[model samples]
Target: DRQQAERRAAELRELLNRYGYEYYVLDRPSVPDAEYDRLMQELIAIEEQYPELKTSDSPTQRIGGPPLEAFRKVAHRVPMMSLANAFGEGDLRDFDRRVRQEVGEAAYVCELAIDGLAVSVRYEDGYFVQGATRGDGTTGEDITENLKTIRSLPLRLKEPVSLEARGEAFMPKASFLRLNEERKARELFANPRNAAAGSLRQLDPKVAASRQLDLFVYGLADAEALGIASHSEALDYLQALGFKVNPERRRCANIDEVIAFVSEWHDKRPQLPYEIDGIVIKVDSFAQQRALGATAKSPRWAIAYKFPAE
Candidate 1:
């Protein structure tokens, strides 16, 4: 190894990668573009002289690669199941009654129901490998290149583990408003969710990168294999693994607490940067979930409590 050049190159790559993650993913830029550009130029110069040093996870890759002719299809090892809906307090109570009948005193985890396109991302030994849409639950279009462009998605995990992470990819309300004004500037996206869907489905990864989409990793496809025992634990694990997880999630001891969470969020919904259509309430325990099981299309252990139209 060329000791001096190689060590400096490696150091530059690590610095730029962290800076990019902070600026793009966390919405917190530690260094000004001026400083970032200076460092980046240095790294680029090194790579130019030694082409072998360039890696795909480089901040340089953030500009994105060439367009795809079309997206390939990938199959979900575990089906992307839907949740049964609860229209009001009465419906939630009914759901709770049913749950209590089957598994008494079950705790619930409430997560904001993201109004976005669902996508599954797979990591093999901590490296982000493949990502695909939920697409009819079984077969989905492979949009790995497009997903890679999302800064919020980690190119590599903090821990080297193999599992498929599922989440909703959405355009933040601020980005949607900006895009529409740019439509007053670039059809207009009817809403943020539509904009997110359109952006990710594009044949070009660059287009997806341009749209400023974000993701919230909500579940592990097979959490039990990783020793996770509950939905809440899985959320914590995902967050620790360097994935964006919505911070507003809550654990409620009973249906009353669940209803309070639903009511509080219904009003608080408008204040969130991203759009949330409802609240997803799931049985907290893995064993309880297994006991409750699921229907052919949706899980009985969980229900989506929808808010009235604003």
Candidate 2:
């Protein structure tokens, strides 16, 4: 009976992950909501009856667990450096010029700069093991439990590979509004970014879950190890592994193309469901990035084109 339960639990976990990937990652659910619920309920019951069969990557784990007494601190294997800011067209061109000076004729990958807290998540053999804040780059607080509560974030990678991914975890505008509306107090979140930061840092995983936070993974800490050649390819690899990556990224041929992307987003900003403060442009090639090198601070290959305050 225990062996049967283990087999069934394994089946259910795979089924639910597939459904979740469709629903959360792809925005398409092949199964009905009630069907997913029924399977999840059955898996929960089985896990309860056979506790030894329960795994950390179970779909039920997304519901969250008990609050931690205090968060543990963890160091980032690769320091999460902050991007240098570009305030205007001149600054962006200057950035491009500087990049070209080193790498020579490098294309850029432009992405929506999410207005949220930056976090790094670690996976060992494709299972989510740890997550941390971008606190001061080198070291951060371990908030793995809180990170697990994000439904879109996969607990198990599609392929069993070990690596760390960096993402911007944010509160959607609709969720931020709903949260503030329900609060009914003088103390209120000033913006979605502020609300996201507050919600993510909660001592209780359930609290983070309730806030409906989401993540869009951007950087793969060690893409070279996986033979990923470019930033765009790395993003594709992240998506393949079931990480929620922002789809609104573009490959720009040159500085002019990058500026065009920035202008387009500026005009279309109000139409988006989430807050984005800027556009992040990075040299696309890994080889080029390595050639560009870095300062003691920000990477030489990337810059954040920050928009003027609303």
Candidate 3:
């Protein structure tokens, strides 16, 4: 009966979605790894029994599918912007003063600048439709098939809506190590960042899936269009929509606090499961961000604190 099928699938989706949110977004796991795997197998079994009941957003679909013919390249709508760079606290302080002159007192958000490929994922009516690389900042090759292989990237939003999220598709340190070990020789990569990029570049979705690729949405690609007021709020919105967000982001009350955050992360970043090249500090409010404006290439309201040579 439709009632029985719907009830079972709904329960499985609910359970799996919660497990994914906790593990990916909260960095907490409510169930044992084995227990989660068992549930996934059960879910897959049920869907196999009734293929008509299978949905694209189901957790079962995370494994990816057959290869595609070719990609469709497109110019980004209001191309995603890049952050200016700062090598030290002095530059951060100068950047802070510039913001104050433009918009007076303001809050700032400091988040790890993940060392991975930049991508933009677009969702329409709550379903994932396409994704692209930052691609020269204005245009990017479509990589929807490859992106679908990332288990951490949700194909459906919690609430039905149309939006785009900008994030890094990365390879975790553990995954990178395992992949390089499996490669054994020339196929070995120098770092997780490079490995992540190379995986996405693969024409085969199956190849990308094997890399255990992950994602952490950093910003709403169309924040202004979404009526989001601040960068901090936009991050929360992304999480509510079932997107994995970097939970380590901190809100600093001033430039000094921002610098302190950067310093703390610089020493502690390697301890994390993923690799981060630097810390990104940005003015929290959209109004201030717009007022401060941007240079030809990077935003004036934000700057990345690149770590000194390892």
Candidate 4:
């Protein structure tokens, strides 16, 4: 019975992944949702019995993963740096003041910080070129197949322009809550970020695609090479090209206004479909950014005022 149980779990995992790829990636599902749900429950039932047998990649990690064994690791042209952490309201205000007086001289722009993994989506002369995880900021695996499954990521840009942009590949809160509920019902916990991330690391792209992941294209990998003058301009630029940019983003003429905007979002973050801890504030002009420049790592132009970690 033990061996039979393990064998059945492995077999079911493979089966579900294939059907998932077809539905999510190929856009032609071989199995109906009812059948798929039945098999999923069946697999979960087995996983409940053989918890130790659930490999991180076994579709049962109940979450997301990285490159295939055969795939080569990729190094991003633009290094993905971690955002400087701000644990409190004071530090956030300091963050605003830290970048060249963090005050009113440089107008601030604020956006809700979506909780998700960072990813690089590159385009060559307007065609989708590559998508990779933000592996250690520099080098990651070439996961283009898995990335292609994200419906929001356009294979062809509306303008046919070329650039490497970044976005938060996230699972919606509804989906997040739904999966977590299933896990809770099963005497377990589920993390949507992990759920979303784990979905991508599938050995098969279909597995990654089928998990119902979503994304929001924030802006270019960096404002420098992209030649965007200010943060607001970049937001508009991203949306104009059909990439998803936050419509809620507000351009404030002063830090006081930015603080008000941040506070508003801080209270309203719960209403968003996705999670948001706080707001990221950035200077609006290329000239001001150039003048302030960056530190050993981060930029002098931007600051994130954190509410709290979830």
Candidate 5:
């Protein structure tokens, strides 16, 4: 019976992780929020009933950790890269043509490129061990202590997995506004992005903790180990591991859908809880991505279709 209980716990963890991945990473929830909540409650009850089976990787244990004095440096296994931007529709179409020429009629994944600093998170055995900024797309400053304060980032993961994932660490509009209001009261900063960057770069963990930062993991550097095929799959995998990912990513069967999604987000950007200056478009097939490959500066298979700053 205990074995059965363990099996059930594993299954429940998998289910919750999938739902969380869908909601947080993929930005598409196949199930209702209430349904997901019910499942989470059930999983918690089971874990509670068998407290011995309670593990750090459990979804219920996302919070609870002390702040750190300083963060440690981590060299990326596969260098976290940057995207070349396309500021106009003409440039976007040009990018599309370039990608098509390279990969030949490939599908694309279009996601709002949330305006924020790029961060790379490394997990070892399903535990979030390190986080850093994308300094020069090669080396980066360690900001693990700062990232730990993000409520959505789980200190532990759902499975005993290891990999490096990347995302934008952004301040939600509400949090950004509240922070600006406080800054105005105290006569502190200029803009929200600047304030967020300053707060996240603080040597004092307490300062970073106070800012209420958020994250959205977008890419996996080592998807092969995790059996992931595309950027979308990588997002799903990260979500399963208890990382928050952008929920607005869309998979387009054709470039038209990609264009439409980009247009839709461009118009709806103001309605989002965070700032997005552009849409990051990627070839949905890993094979295509590899075939398209990358140059020294940017990936040929992916491009950031930037919107006009409001």
Candidate 6:
């Protein structure tokens, strides 16, 4: 019966979406490219034979949609807060002291801050429902279609969870370099980050997809309801839900361990495939975070220790 065919079609769509998200967003692929291509081809064949099963949200339909003339403005449910940066060990230590004063002695989580544009992605019942740029802290421009093209971002989660996660969306060094070469050939771009930003702001998401931009989910914007306890736990939970989180994240018992982690990355940054501007240090306990609270603009519980720009 067509019901069986319909079910198969749905299953195929889900698999393709998962694979795309893992490869594009997470920088991890469970299946080889050839296998993915083969499955996609099979899905296409099935859909072609069953025209009645065709849907607007099919994976195959992602590439050639109508271009948008302008992006619509969207106000974030929770204001997309910005980070306060620290330049050196002294500043980092000061940040540590502030957190200690507010929350007492607690463990910290250190995460790499990928240098890119801040994006907010919302999920409802496990499905990706909304995505926007960090417009002005209070509001942003809707870029859902552009975000969908990322392939790494899950269109649906493995579990039916509703929450919003914030992170930096940036292009990989290889992709950035290739893009710069092409731009240089055309005498167009000044730098990779510039190229990445320009590509992301494009009206056509297909164009953005071609740029191969990726994201690293940093912190949960709404962690209280999700039973997530700390910055480190939020990262783990995000990973468990099939989101592409930064694998380099670490937990440090004290400032010395955090400093060691940072020092190691300082020498090892060049070896990584992506560019990271700094390390983000946060109080590891949510209760502690609450005690630390925030300043008017930045979180008093967290600090971003920025590396010198290359």
Instruction: Give the count of colliding residue pairs in each prediction.
Output: 2, 0, 0, 9, 1, 2
**Candidate 1 runs further than 4 Å off:** 1-9, 20-34, 44-52
Q: How does residue 74 of candidate 2 score in lDDT?
A: 91
Deviating ranges (above 4 Å) for candidate 2: 29-32, 185-187
Top candidate (TM-score)? 2
Candidate 4 lDDT, 205-242, residue by residue in tens: 66676666777777786666777877778878877776
lDDT of each: 0.87, 0.91, 0.85, 0.71, 0.76, 0.80
Q: How accurate is candidate 2 locally (lDDT)?
A: 0.91
- Model 3 per-residue lDDT tens digits across residues 1-310: 4578778887887788768766755668645677678878877877777887777777776666677777777785668778788998899889999999989988999999999999999988988888898888889989887888787787777888998889999999999999998899546799988998998977788889889899999988778888999999999999888898888999999998998898899889869999999999999999998998888788899898888887
Give candidate 2's error at residue 27 in angstroms.
0.4
Q: What would you estimate as the lDDT of candidate 5? A: 0.76
* C-alpha TM-score for every candidate: 0.92, 0.96, 0.89, 0.72, 0.77, 0.90
Cα deviation at 295, candidate 5, in Å, is 1.0
What is every candidate's alpha-carbon RMSD to the true fold?
A: 2.2, 1.6, 2.6, 10.9, 6.2, 2.5
Q: How many backbone clashes can be found in candidate 2? A: 0
The residue ranges of model 3 lying beyond 4 angstroms of the native Cα positions read 1-15, 27-39, 42-54
Clashing pairs in 4: 21-206, 64-197, 64-198, 64-199, 65-198, 65-201, 66-201, 96-102, 97-102
- The candidate that wins on lDDT is 2
Model 3 residue pairs with clashes: none
- Error in Å for residue 167 of model 2: 0.7
TM value for model 4: 0.72
lDDT per residue (tens digit) for residues 40-68 in model 1: 88877777788777666665555577898
Ranking 2 against 6 by lDDT, winner: 2
* Prediction 4 global C-alpha lDDT: 0.71
